[PDB]
């Protein structure tokens, strides 16, 4: 029985994919089963977070306590800028996981599962 509140995540660093596009590396731990629990990593682009927020809020309505900051329209989304947003983005996801409304969210699960948000 899926329960995202029993999933712990962190974004320990920013990496590169394709070494061309910068991405957040999201470590996931899944504790809604099992001694040792399940764990993996996922790589998400800056823009994918905004699509997640758009899609979640469309389906579930807004979350006052969990808001992404304004999307950068003018300027580069390079390594140092992703690095500057790491902690905010980590906190955003962690708060989402504790919303009862999202404890069985397919969007959030897909977002936090390896291998949609374009």
UniProtKB/Swiss-Prot annotation:
It is found in: Lysosome membrane; Late endosome membrane; Cell projection, Dendrite. Widely expressed both in fetal and adult tissues. Residues 12-115 form the PX domain. It comes from the Eukaryota. Belongs to the sorting nexin family. Plays a role in maintaining normal neuronal excitability and synaptic transmission. May be involved in several stages of intracellular trafficking. Required for autophagosome clearance, possibly by mediating the fusion of lysosomes with autophagosomes. Binds phosphatidylinositol 3,5-bisphosphate (PtdIns(3,5)P2), a key component of late endosomes/lysosomes. Does not bind phosphatidylinositol 3-phosphate (PtdIns(3P)). This is Sorting nexin-14. It comes from Homo sapiens. The chain holds residues 559 to 693 of 946 of the full protein.
